[PDB]
Write an enzyme that holds these catalytic residues in place. Sequence first.
Site, PDB file in Angstrom:
ATOM      1  N   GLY A  14       0.830  -1.192   0.000  1.00 53.75           N
ATOM      2  CA  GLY A  14       0.000   0.000   0.000  1.00 53.75           C
ATOM      3  C   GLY A  14       0.866   1.242   0.000  1.00 53.75           C
ATOM      4  N   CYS A  41       3.908  -9.047   1.108  1.00 53.34           N
ATOM      5  CA  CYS A  41       3.943  -9.537  -0.259  1.00 53.34           C
ATOM      6  C   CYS A  41       5.287 -10.101  -0.700  1.00 53.34           C
ATOM      7  N   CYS A  46       3.172 -13.450  -1.005  1.00 56.19           N
ATOM      8  CA  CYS A  46       3.142 -13.598  -2.471  1.00 56.19           C
ATOM      9  C   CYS A  46       4.395 -14.129  -3.207  1.00 56.19           C
ATOM     10  N   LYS A  49       5.989 -17.593  -1.540  1.00 55.70           N
ATOM     11  CA  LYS A  49       5.000 -18.665  -1.752  1.00 55.70           C
ATOM     12  C   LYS A  49       5.000 -19.111  -3.217  1.00 55.70           C
ATOM     13  N   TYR A 176      -7.061 -19.645   2.642  1.00 50.59           N
ATOM     14  CA  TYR A 176      -6.043 -19.444   1.613  1.00 50.59           C
ATOM     15  C   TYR A 176      -4.675 -19.998   1.987  1.00 50.59           C
ATOM     16  N   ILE A 177      -4.168 -19.622   3.152  1.00 48.19           N
ATOM     17  CA  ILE A 177      -2.781 -19.952   3.509  1.00 48.19           C
ATOM     18  C   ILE A 177      -2.596 -21.442   3.806  1.00 48.19           C
ATOM     19  N   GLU A 180      -2.853 -23.420   0.351  1.00 50.23           N
ATOM     20  CA  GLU A 180      -1.653 -23.206  -0.418  1.00 50.23           C
ATOM     21  C   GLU A 180      -0.487 -23.905   0.250  1.00 50.23           C
ATOM     22  N   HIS A 438      -7.651 -23.526 -29.174  1.00 50.12           N
ATOM     23  CA  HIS A 438      -7.586 -24.952 -28.876  1.00 50.12           C
ATOM     24  C   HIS A 438      -6.122 -25.398 -28.964  1.00 50.12           C
ATOM     25  N   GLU A 443     -10.469 -22.079 -23.125  1.00 51.74           N
ATOM     26  CA  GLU A 443     -11.539 -22.166 -24.108  1.00 51.74           C
ATOM     27  C   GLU A 443     -12.862 -22.788 -23.626  1.00 51.74           C
TER      28      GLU A 443
HETATM   29  C1  LIG Z   1       0.935 -30.576 -36.535  1.00 53.37           C
HETATM   30  C2  LIG Z   1      -0.296 -29.672 -36.518  1.00 53.37           C
HETATM   31  C3  LIG Z   1      -0.586 -28.948 -35.357  1.00 53.37           C
HETATM   32  C4  LIG Z   1      -1.753 -28.158 -35.294  1.00 53.37           C
HETATM   33  N1  LIG Z   1      -2.010 -27.552 -34.111  1.00 53.37           N
HETATM   34  C5  LIG Z   1      -3.108 -26.748 -33.994  1.00 53.37           C
HETATM   35  C6  LIG Z   1      -3.349 -26.090 -32.725  1.00 53.37           C
HETATM   36  O1  LIG Z   1      -2.646 -26.279 -31.734  1.00 53.37           O
HETATM   37  N2  LIG Z   1      -4.460 -25.265 -32.650  1.00 53.37           N
HETATM   38  C7  LIG Z   1      -5.370 -25.164 -33.715  1.00 53.37           C
HETATM   39  O2  LIG Z   1      -6.469 -24.654 -33.472  1.00 53.37           O
HETATM   40  N3  LIG Z   1      -5.109 -25.732 -34.910  1.00 53.37           N
HETATM   41  C8  LIG Z   1      -3.998 -26.537 -35.052  1.00 53.37           C
HETATM   42  N4  LIG Z   1      -3.727 -27.206 -36.237  1.00 53.37           N
HETATM   43  C9  LIG Z   1      -4.655 -27.017 -37.371  1.00 53.37           C
HETATM   44  C10 LIG Z   1      -5.946 -27.847 -37.252  1.00 53.37           C
HETATM   45  O3  LIG Z   1      -5.576 -29.202 -36.936  1.00 53.37           O
HETATM   46  C11 LIG Z   1      -6.773 -27.779 -38.550  1.00 53.37           C
HETATM   47  O4  LIG Z   1      -6.874 -26.413 -39.000  1.00 53.37           O
HETATM   48  C12 LIG Z   1      -8.183 -28.373 -38.437  1.00 53.37           C
HETATM   49  O5  LIG Z   1      -8.149 -29.742 -38.025  1.00 53.37           O
HETATM   50  C13 LIG Z   1      -8.817 -28.295 -39.810  1.00 53.37           C
HETATM   51  O6  LIG Z   1     -10.258 -28.749 -39.791  1.00 53.37           O
HETATM   52  P1  LIG Z   1     -10.945 -29.329 -41.097  1.00 53.37           P
HETATM   53  O7  LIG Z   1     -12.275 -29.786 -40.697  1.00 53.37           O
HETATM   54  O8  LIG Z   1     -10.881 -28.285 -42.174  1.00 53.37           O
HETATM   55  O9  LIG Z   1     -10.049 -30.519 -41.544  1.00 53.37           O
HETATM   56  P2  LIG Z   1      -9.376 -31.762 -40.868  1.00 53.37           P
HETATM   57  O10 LIG Z   1      -9.320 -31.708 -39.399  1.00 53.37           O
HETATM   58  O11 LIG Z   1      -8.121 -31.982 -41.610  1.00 53.37           O
HETATM   59  O12 LIG Z   1     -10.332 -33.002 -41.157  1.00 53.37           O
HETATM   60  C14 LIG Z   1     -10.712 -33.327 -42.569  1.00 53.37           C
HETATM   61  C15 LIG Z   1     -11.064 -34.772 -42.728  1.00 53.37           C
HETATM   62  O13 LIG Z   1     -11.450 -34.983 -44.082  1.00 53.37           O
HETATM   63  C16 LIG Z   1     -11.237 -36.343 -44.335  1.00 53.37           C
HETATM   64  N5  LIG Z   1     -11.323 -36.563 -45.744  1.00 53.37           N
HETATM   65  C17 LIG Z   1     -10.656 -35.888 -46.709  1.00 53.37           C
HETATM   66  N6  LIG Z   1     -11.093 -36.177 -47.891  1.00 53.37           N
HETATM   67  C18 LIG Z   1     -12.104 -37.110 -47.733  1.00 53.37           C
HETATM   68  C19 LIG Z   1     -12.949 -37.777 -48.629  1.00 53.37           C
HETATM   69  N7  LIG Z   1     -12.923 -37.519 -49.932  1.00 53.37           N
HETATM   70  N8  LIG Z   1     -13.783 -38.684 -48.154  1.00 53.37           N
HETATM   71  C20 LIG Z   1     -13.862 -38.838 -46.831  1.00 53.37           C
HETATM   72  N9  LIG Z   1     -13.109 -38.291 -45.878  1.00 53.37           N
HETATM   73  C21 LIG Z   1     -12.230 -37.395 -46.382  1.00 53.37           C
HETATM   74  C22 LIG Z   1      -9.855 -36.558 -43.805  1.00 53.37           C
HETATM   75  O14 LIG Z   1      -9.660 -37.971 -43.578  1.00 53.37           O
HETATM   76  C23 LIG Z   1      -9.899 -35.735 -42.497  1.00 53.37           C
HETATM   77  O15 LIG Z   1     -10.267 -36.539 -41.415  1.00 53.37           O
HETATM   78  C24 LIG Z   1      -2.608 -28.021 -36.393  1.00 53.37           C
HETATM   79  C25 LIG Z   1      -2.283 -28.695 -37.607  1.00 53.37           C
HETATM   80  C26 LIG Z   1      -1.142 -29.536 -37.683  1.00 53.37           C
HETATM   81  C27 LIG Z   1      -0.784 -30.253 -38.991  1.00 53.37           C
HETATM   82  C1  LIG Z   2       1.441 -16.521   3.187  1.00 51.85           C
HETATM   83  C2  LIG Z   2       0.785 -15.406   2.430  1.00 51.85           C
HETATM   84  C3  LIG Z   2       0.534 -15.561   1.052  1.00 51.85           C
HETATM   85  C4  LIG Z   2      -0.069 -14.510   0.330  1.00 51.85           C
HETATM   86  N1  LIG Z   2      -0.267 -14.687  -1.003  1.00 51.85           N
HETATM   87  C5  LIG Z   2      -0.837 -13.664  -1.731  1.00 51.85           C
HETATM   88  C6  LIG Z   2      -1.025 -13.819  -3.173  1.00 51.85           C
HETATM   89  O1  LIG Z   2      -0.536 -14.751  -3.835  1.00 51.85           O
HETATM   90  N2  LIG Z   2      -1.759 -12.808  -3.828  1.00 51.85           N
HETATM   91  C7  LIG Z   2      -2.166 -11.661  -3.169  1.00 51.85           C
HETATM   92  O2  LIG Z   2      -2.655 -10.758  -3.853  1.00 51.85           O
HETATM   93  N3  LIG Z   2      -1.964 -11.523  -1.846  1.00 51.85           N
HETATM   94  C8  LIG Z   2      -1.319 -12.494  -1.126  1.00 51.85           C
HETATM   95  N4  LIG Z   2      -1.116 -12.355   0.235  1.00 51.85           N
HETATM   96  C9  LIG Z   2      -1.668 -11.192   0.966  1.00 51.85           C
HETATM   97  C10 LIG Z   2      -0.758  -9.980   0.777  1.00 51.85           C
HETATM   98  O3  LIG Z   2       0.592 -10.391   1.003  1.00 51.85           O
HETATM   99  C11 LIG Z   2      -1.150  -8.743   1.626  1.00 51.85           C
HETATM  100  O4  LIG Z   2      -2.553  -8.517   1.519  1.00 51.85           O
HETATM  101  C12 LIG Z   2      -0.421  -7.451   1.233  1.00 51.85           C
HETATM  102  O5  LIG Z   2       0.987  -7.571   1.493  1.00 51.85           O
HETATM  103  C13 LIG Z   2      -0.975  -6.323   2.087  1.00 51.85           C
HETATM  104  O6  LIG Z   2      -0.198  -5.064   1.885  1.00 51.85           O
HETATM  105  P1  LIG Z   2      -0.225  -3.898   2.972  1.00 51.85           P
HETATM  106  O7  LIG Z   2       0.262  -2.710   2.259  1.00 51.85           O
HETATM  107  O8  LIG Z   2      -1.534  -3.762   3.644  1.00 51.85           O
HETATM  108  O9  LIG Z   2       0.796  -4.371   4.124  1.00 51.85           O
HETATM  109  P2  LIG Z   2       2.107  -5.292   4.219  1.00 51.85           P
HETATM  110  O10 LIG Z   2       2.609  -5.707   2.909  1.00 51.85           O
HETATM  111  O11 LIG Z   2       1.869  -6.294   5.287  1.00 51.85           O
HETATM  112  O12 LIG Z   2       3.215  -4.340   4.801  1.00 51.85           O
HETATM  113  C14 LIG Z   2       2.906  -3.347   5.883  1.00 51.85           C
HETATM  114  C15 LIG Z   2       4.250  -2.868   6.363  1.00 51.85           C
HETATM  115  O13 LIG Z   2       4.074  -2.024   7.491  1.00 51.85           O
HETATM  116  C16 LIG Z   2       5.249  -2.166   8.221  1.00 51.85           C
HETATM  117  N5  LIG Z   2       5.047  -1.586   9.528  1.00 51.85           N
HETATM  118  C17 LIG Z   2       4.155  -1.962  10.476  1.00 51.85           C
HETATM  119  N6  LIG Z   2       4.164  -1.165  11.501  1.00 51.85           N
HETATM  120  C18 LIG Z   2       5.113  -0.219  11.240  1.00 51.85           C
HETATM  121  C19 LIG Z   2       5.503   0.910  11.919  1.00 51.85           C
HETATM  122  N7  LIG Z   2       4.796   1.273  12.990  1.00 51.85           N
HETATM  123  N8  LIG Z   2       6.553   1.589  11.461  1.00 51.85           N
HETATM  124  C20 LIG Z   2       7.170   1.160  10.362  1.00 51.85           C
HETATM  125  N9  LIG Z   2       6.817   0.174   9.552  1.00 51.85           N
HETATM  126  C21 LIG Z   2       5.745  -0.513  10.051  1.00 51.85           C
HETATM  127  C22 LIG Z   2       5.403  -3.654   8.278  1.00 51.85           C
HETATM  128  O14 LIG Z   2       6.748  -4.035   8.583  1.00 51.85           O
HETATM  129  C23 LIG Z   2       5.038  -4.055   6.872  1.00 51.85           C
HETATM  130  O15 LIG Z   2       6.163  -4.235   6.026  1.00 51.85           O
HETATM  131  C24 LIG Z   2      -0.438 -13.320   0.969  1.00 51.85           C
HETATM  132  C25 LIG Z   2      -0.158 -13.145   2.352  1.00 51.85           C
HETATM  133  C26 LIG Z   2       0.459 -14.164   3.091  1.00 51.85           C
HETATM  134  C27 LIG Z   2       0.770 -13.896   4.532  1.00 51.85           C
END
Ligand SMILES: Cc1cc2nc3c(=O)[nH]c(=O)nc-3n(C[C@H](O)[C@H](O)[C@H](O)COP(=O)(O)OP(=O)(O)OC[C@H]3O[C@@H](n4cnc5c(N)ncnc54)[C@H](O)[C@@H]3O)c2cc1C
Ligand SMILES: Cc1cc2nc3c(=O)[nH]c(=O)nc-3n(C[C@H](O)[C@H](O)[C@H](O)COP(=O)(O)OP(=O)(O)OC[C@H]3O[C@@H](n4cnc5c(N)ncnc54)[C@H](O)[C@@H]3O)c2cc1C
Lengths: 449, 448
Positions: A14, A41, A46, A49, A176-177, A180, A438, A443
């Site tokens: 803060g 934090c 934060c 952890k 939470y704590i 985690e 995908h 998604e």
């Molecule tokens: C290695 C690789 C990684 C990819 N990774 C991703 C990804 O991570 N994310 C993403 O969204 N896209 C990805 N793609 C692209 C995605 O797979 C294609 O864009 C999508 O499958 C195309 O949909 P479609 O219906 O046009 O054709 P297809 O999925 O190719 O299906 C067409 C079908 O038609 C059939 N067919 C063809 N001719 C005939 C026929 N005359 N008679 C009967 N059956 C027939 C075939 O057998 C085939 O099954 C990837 C492509 C490759 C090659």
């Molecule tokens: C184990 C754990 C995990 C957490 N994980 C997350 C997480 O993943 N995501 C998330 O968003 N939040 C998380 N939090 C919560 C988050 O850490 C706190 O909400 C955030 O630090 C609060 O900020 P603050 O400014 O109120 O005070 P703090 O960050 O606590 O700091 C206040 C400061 O005031 C100082 N102070 C106090 N009195 C005096 C004084 N009189 N004179 C001088 N200095 C002084 C203290 O030393 C301290 O450093 C976690 C907390 C814990 C304990």
Amino acid sequence: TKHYDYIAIGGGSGGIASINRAAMYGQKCALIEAKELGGTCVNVGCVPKKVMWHAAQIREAIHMYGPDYGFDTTINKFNWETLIASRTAYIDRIHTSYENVLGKNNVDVIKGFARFVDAKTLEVNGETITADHILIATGGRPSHPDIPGVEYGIDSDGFFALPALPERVAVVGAGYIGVELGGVINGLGAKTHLFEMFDAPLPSFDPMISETLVEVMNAEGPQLHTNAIPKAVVKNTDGSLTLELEDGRSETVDCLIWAIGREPANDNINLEAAGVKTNEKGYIVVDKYQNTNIEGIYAVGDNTGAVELTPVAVAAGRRLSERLFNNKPDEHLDYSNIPTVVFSHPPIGTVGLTEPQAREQYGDDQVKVYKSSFTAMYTAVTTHRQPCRMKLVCVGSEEKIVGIHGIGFGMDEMLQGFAVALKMGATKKDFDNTVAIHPTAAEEFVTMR
Amino acid sequence: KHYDYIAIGGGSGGIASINRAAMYGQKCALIEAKELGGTCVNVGCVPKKVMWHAAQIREAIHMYGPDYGFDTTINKFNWETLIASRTAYIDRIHTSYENVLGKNNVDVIKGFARFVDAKTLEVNGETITADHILIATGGRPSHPDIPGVEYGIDSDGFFALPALPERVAVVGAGYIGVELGGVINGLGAKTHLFEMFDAPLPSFDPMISETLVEVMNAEGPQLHTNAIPKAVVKNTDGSLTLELEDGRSETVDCLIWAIGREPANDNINLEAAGVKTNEKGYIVVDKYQNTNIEGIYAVGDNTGAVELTPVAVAAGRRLSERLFNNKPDEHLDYSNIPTVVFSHPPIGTVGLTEPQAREQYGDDQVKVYKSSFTAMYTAVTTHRQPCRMKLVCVGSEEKIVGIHGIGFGMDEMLQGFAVALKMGATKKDFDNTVAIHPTAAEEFVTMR
Ligand SMILES: Cc1cc2nc3c(=O)[nH]c(=O)nc-3n(C[C@H](O)[C@H](O)[C@H](O)COP(=O)(O)OP(=O)(O)OC[C@H]3O[C@@H](n4cnc5c(N)ncnc54)[C@H](O)[C@@H]3O)c2cc1C
Ligand SMILES: Cc1cc2nc3c(=O)[nH]c(=O)nc-3n(C[C@H](O)[C@H](O)[C@H](O)COP(=O)(O)OP(=O)(O)OC[C@H]3O[C@@H](n4cnc5c(N)ncnc54)[C@H](O)[C@@H]3O)c2cc1C
Ligand SMILES: NC(=O)c1ccc[n+]([C@@H]2O[C@H](COP(=O)([O-])OP(=O)(O)OC[C@H]3O[C@@H](n4cnc5c(N)ncnc54)[C@H](O)[C@@H]3O)[C@@H](O)[C@H]2O)c1
Ligand SMILES: NC(=O)c1ccc[n+]([C@@H]2O[C@H](COP(=O)([O-])OP(=O)(O)OC[C@H]3O[C@@H](n4cnc5c(N)ncnc54)[C@H](O)[C@@H]3O)[C@@H](O)[C@H]2O)c1
């Protein structure tokens, strides 16, 4: 005394977001941090952890999924010291980046613990400084249960200081704590137990999330214990600790982590002196514009009781500096439809109303839910297949989307985009009219039937 | 036999159009020569992604695990386990596909169909007839016309490989070449990628080409641009030496052509139906997927449109909506289609590239926002990898017309942003959303 235009107490999320934005418009600023820059934090939350989450993801790759993809691997050694050194080095480089930016913006960083001498004066290390605008961004800290042997458990701050991975770990509290860390420790190899007072982990999330999470955990660990109400922690003769529950169940482990909530750090700064008002829980009460009841004192972040998330302290802190120092008198954070990702196994993404909330608010005949369930493709070709469940909660004839929830591989990076569309008032037809990408988990939300 | 609607091709397009048609009470038959799923299930998107997940697991073990503290030995990599596991997955998908068509009452006819005339088809000796016929036959790999071309395989051959070769040359560095090259390199083979132009993915936004060249220079495959093969020599020892027009040479064990695809529209006697094709052999269709002959339609790769599965599915379900659910203007808007390349690292792109945006709207109108950072997953390693993102905005409103990125997370983050892009989002929409931390994605809503 040195006088500033704006002073922030707290160099966390803060505090840093607001001071740099104000500075950026010419305000002479001071930032006071008692420990390390970056607050929770960066140091114990934060960033560490998520490095611990990636380390767990790597071991599950080597050890759980790698087999079925054809990799036979031996982990000759898991060097915790090397993980903690890479994690810590990265956080020291982030500390520099921050010092760099505060430096280019001329902010004076003062390392010490600030207290209020009156509504406009702060004393830090015997020196006295004053400003016209003071921001209290003190954050919060781990809560601990008032039970015998409570002192044998550590909390999430103690987790980031762990010298070694214990072989048996109990995490008590499955919000939470615990979810985690339970996921992380489990995934890193320890025998983990997660105890939750209520009948389901993540009790406040949409029911579909809590239910999938129970399924996954029954199958891969951690071992979940619901209705678990801690009675005491016994330190055993051999050094292990036995957690004793009210209902008689017990569990003996090497390390007990309390993850039962966070309290606010507002108690030692002599607020009374400045007259700032806090509520019965001890949070500083703020209005919509982050103002306390005293004119010129503001508070953002976890000490205010708002949703405890770093981006939220950054946006409310930053918008407060816009409003105050860059002439946008109505800037303020909108606290609704804020997205969250839990970095659990698998990760959770949610924004909006849970289905229960939508049926309460709008009524059953107005609420239309879409649900998809499938196997994450990464686990599909292995013997550790894992579910992805996703849900869209829609309302009215238009099917205005009011809640988006998912638990599955992919959830952590997919949610941001969908939450921008939710903010834009997307309807289901808006999702349906976008071409899918995908193969992705993503998604599924634009092809829900 | 007589049908209301017949799809020639059981691929992405044919399956989607027919099951939608069957939902409106039409009597449908799906004809397929080989396997259900087309190029996508069988030798495309699905087995490629399993292979990508295999490379990532090996990269995690071998390239990033030591920095996170895991000292591992890959005792053995068993290619046969991975293929059995992959193949089994695909047989599972085929069983679902049969199941859907069957519940929808689609007649599947296994055979290669040919036109007798505009409304008549011969398949396996049988004549079947219909009033609406969709040709969804997709395409196949192209191969260069050079000495020794028959020593190289194409992407179909890749999925039939009995083992990983030690040294591989991918010729063609477009979608397939870049994706297979990065898989084969990540699985440990010495991989070379050759491209006749000066850049990999030469039609993508420049930021994406530039970043790919960088990571490939660091992590492989070994890229050779301005390289056009002249001949392939097979050697005495059975290796293959690729001879370039410029005289450079490389000796590998295996060569994969990834030079482009061509429409599979030739042995189906389009001439008897009078359907017309263009110079490249694609079926000429209009906005509504109609051919020149009334009652005959075409979708997908055999029409020359963008070769993606979502696109053939989307055009095919919208055609059935138009034809059988009385929606006479229903058609696919082919603009702003999102695309992800499952390269190392994955590329995500929807919309106009910065060059395109600047031509169409003028420099004067274009604002670009950029971000370069290190993928957090790699930041704690000695194999840190960039993550670059770019938003292209036009006007005072900064209407987003292009979203581009290359880096970890790009494969899953793009779908949401593409909905927002389809809704007409401006940069104000992106920044009024709260970020999720810590993620790569939060970058698109915090750029300044
Ligand atoms: C290695 C690789 C990684 C990819 N990774 C991703 C990804 O991570 N994310 C993403 O969204 N896209 C990805 N793609 C692209 C995605 O797979 C294609 O864009 C999508 O499958 C195309 O949909 P479609 O219906 O046009 O054709 P297809 O999925 O190719 O299906 C067409 C079908 O038609 C059939 N067919 C063809 N001719 C005939 C026929 N005359 N008679 C009967 N059956 C027939 C075939 O057998 C085939 O099954 C990837 C492509 C490759 C090659
Ligand atoms: C184990 C754990 C995990 C957490 N994980 C997350 C997480 O993943 N995501 C998330 O968003 N939040 C998380 N939090 C919560 C988050 O850490 C706190 O909400 C955030 O630090 C609060 O900020 P603050 O400014 O109120 O005070 P703090 O960050 O606590 O700091 C206040 C400061 O005031 C100082 N102070 C106090 N009195 C005096 C004084 N009189 N004179 C001088 N200095 C002084 C203290 O030393 C301290 O450093 C976690 C907390 C814990 C304990
Ligand atoms: N990824 C993220 O966004 C993230 C992660 C971690 C923390 N944070 C923030 O920090 C906040 C505080 O986290 P937290 O998990 O400490 O609090 P929490 O309230 O989220 O979880 C506490 C859990 O422990 C249970 N519990 C309470 N008392 C118990 C007891 N006596 N015995 C057994 N179980 C008990 C509660 O029912 C609850 O389920 C979070 O709510 C969140 O806002 C954010
Ligand atoms: N993830 C996805 O979305 C996905 C993945 C793979 C394929 N596909 C689709 O399949 C289509 C065809 O894919 P493709 O990758 O085979 O082709 P392509 O057209 O994408 O790339 C062919 C490349 O080979 C180069 N080239 C051509 N002749 C050459 C030669 N003689 N020597 C050296 N280089 C040469 C071309 O310049 C081009 O760079 C793609 O356009 C794409 O739409 C989609």
